[PDB]
């Protein structure tokens, strides 16, 4: 048999649905949803890492001028400083007291730590909706995984599943991300060989093996110390430590709608937007014949005690005569209030126990235990407790239902404006027609 | 649950009160004071004899 419905994505939350076959007994199928992920398509832009100034030894020329050429390194400077009298250890480095030059150059390289400490810079494409889903099919705990994009059927115990598509294509994950270890975060990076010095991308590569190295520092080559023979030089530091200690805080803590963030691959976990389509291939053996399955009458329900503390606070009690002993479903006929059990055993005269959750201040609803609906209706109590670790069981307030029944004070005072409204048009009325048949 | 009630004063009387939380049975509590003891604190003036 093939029976769609919709569930809410929230996840931990079990939803319960009527299976309604004609001739055959009501069932009643817990769904709830363990794991919903979003697996996004990258497709890596580039990589971002620390990079290293070599700087060869300095070319000192005495009695003579020295001269460099243009190499194809990935920042290459160099310069020629006239005028330098460097020493060294032993003294001045050699004679002629002028007109000595100093040969600096110097180029910027990807360290060896980009082969390990590196930002990956993605762009991200349709996701690939999955999700993770148990069913009390038949008193048994069933577990499915599949595909949510409407495809891709799975079949345990001869029930077929088909998941998706998702109502809402909502991710958290922008069109262009970065992945630094195991943390995601939404920036506009820039893009490959146009990087600009001090921030995220001055030293840019496609791959992290790969020798094409983008770099722009802004390497300036300065006049070294009188008396020295080092090479100075001024050049903006490394973005990628910069950002590294003004990164932020990632996705995993800013995502909206409580999204859990994972790398390796890159995930988004639980989003609880949008909602569901589920379509089961039900076999027919699961059913029962409506003759065939236990029919109860004679039946009474009692609410001990209701609180809406959205932990099932509500329990009541059904008073049954069951024609024979089975198995049978019981559903609530409205959406106000959910029941925690789907189906209970059922034995002669006796009594069953169920439980509850709602947000009505009195619960008003009709349970159909086994193709019979009781009615059941009982005052309920606010709980004492503010805050609670857990989402809330039931379903949501709904515009004027809540309304306690104690409302009757509406009743009565609509009542008497409507008997003043009433008395008064009576009046007018007389009038008028008196007034219309007086010539 | 806090429970507020107010009792009278008299020593080797019982009163009960009826703690009515919602959703449970009621419970029923007999409270007696057994003895009320008013110590004043004293400052001593002086001693005579
Ligand atoms: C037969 O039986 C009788 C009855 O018990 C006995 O009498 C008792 O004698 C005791 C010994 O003198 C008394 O005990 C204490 O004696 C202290 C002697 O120095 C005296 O100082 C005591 O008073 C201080 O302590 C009291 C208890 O803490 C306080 O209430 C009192 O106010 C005093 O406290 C000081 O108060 C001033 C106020 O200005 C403060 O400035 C001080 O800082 C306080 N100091 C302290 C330390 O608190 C106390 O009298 C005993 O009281 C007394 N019985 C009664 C009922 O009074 C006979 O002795 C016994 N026969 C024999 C042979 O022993
Ligand atoms: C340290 O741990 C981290 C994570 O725990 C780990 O980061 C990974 O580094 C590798 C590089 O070795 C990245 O690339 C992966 O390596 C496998 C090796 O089997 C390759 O198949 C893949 O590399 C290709 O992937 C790109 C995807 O399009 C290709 O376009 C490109 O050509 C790459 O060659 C695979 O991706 C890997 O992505 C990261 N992981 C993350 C989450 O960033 C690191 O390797 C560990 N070791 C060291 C020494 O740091
Ligand atoms: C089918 O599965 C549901 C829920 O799925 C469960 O999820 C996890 C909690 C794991 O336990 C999974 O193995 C399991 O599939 C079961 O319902 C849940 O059963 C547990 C039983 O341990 C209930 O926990 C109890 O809760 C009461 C009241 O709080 C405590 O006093 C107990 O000590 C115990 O902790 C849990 O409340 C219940 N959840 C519901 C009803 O929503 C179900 O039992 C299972 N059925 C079968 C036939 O396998």
């Known amino acids: 048999y093939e029976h769609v419905t919709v569930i809410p994505n929230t996840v931990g939350v079990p939803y319960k649905t009527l299976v309604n076959r004609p001739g055959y007994s009501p069932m009643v199928l817990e769904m709830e949803l363990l794991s919903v992920t979003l697996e996004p398509t990258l497709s890596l832009d580039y990589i971002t890492c620390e990079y290293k100034t070599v700087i060869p030894s300095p070319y000192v020329k005495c009695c003579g001028t020295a001269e460099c050429k243009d190499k194809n390194l990935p920042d290459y400077s160099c310069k020629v400083f006239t005028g330098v009298y460097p020493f060294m250890w032993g003294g001045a480095y050699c004679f002629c007291d002028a007109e000595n030059t100093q040969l600096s150059e110097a180029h910027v390289e990807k360290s060896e730590s980009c082969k390990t400490e590196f930002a990956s810079a993605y762009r991200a494409h349709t996701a690939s909706a999955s999700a993770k889903l148990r069913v009390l099919y038949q008193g ?17 115990k001869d029930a077929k599943f088909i998941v998706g598509p998702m109502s809402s294509a909502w991710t958290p994950f922008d069109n262009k991300i970065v992945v630094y270890k195991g943390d995601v975060y939404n ?5 490959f060989g146009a990087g600009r010095p001090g921030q995220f991308g001055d030293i840019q590569s496609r791959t992290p093996e790969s020798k094409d190295v983008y770099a722009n520092t802004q390497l300036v080559l300065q006049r070294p110390a009188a008396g020295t023979v080092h090479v100075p030089y001024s050049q903006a530091p490394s973005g990628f430590k910069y950002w590294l200690k003004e990164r932020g805080a990632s996705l995993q803590h800013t995502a909206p709608f409580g999204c859990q963030i994972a790398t390796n691959p890159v995930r988004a976990v639980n989003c609880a937007v949008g909602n ?16 065939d399955a236990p029919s109860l009458t004679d039946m009474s329900c009692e609410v001990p005690a209701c609180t809406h503390s959205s932990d099932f606070g509500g329990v009541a009690v059904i008073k049954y005569a069951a024609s024979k002993k089975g198995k049978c479903a019981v559903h609530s006929m409205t959406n106000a209030v959910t029941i925690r059990e789907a189906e209970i055993e059922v034995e002669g005269n006796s009594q069953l126990q169920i439980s509850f959750s709602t947000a009505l201040a009195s619960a008003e609803f009709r349970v159909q235990v086994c193709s019979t609906q009781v009615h059941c ?7 004492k407790d503010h805050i609670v670790n857990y989402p809330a069981s039931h379903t949501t307030l709904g515009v004027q239902d809540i309304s306690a ?33 007086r010539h």
């Open 140 to 156: 048994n705990n069933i577990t499915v995984t599949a595909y949510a994009n409407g495809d891709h059927a799975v079949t345990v």
């Open 187 to 191: 920036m506009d990076y820039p893009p």
């Open 276 to 291: 569901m389509p589920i379509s089961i291939d039900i076999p027919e053996a699961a059913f029962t014949r409506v003759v």
């Open 377 to 383: 209706a009982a005052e309920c109590h606010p709980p």
């Open 405 to 437: 029944t104690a409302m009757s004070w509406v009743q009565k005072i609509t009542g008497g404006v409507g008997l003043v409204v009433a008395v008064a048009a009576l009046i007018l009325i007389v009038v008028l027609c008196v007034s219309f048949s």
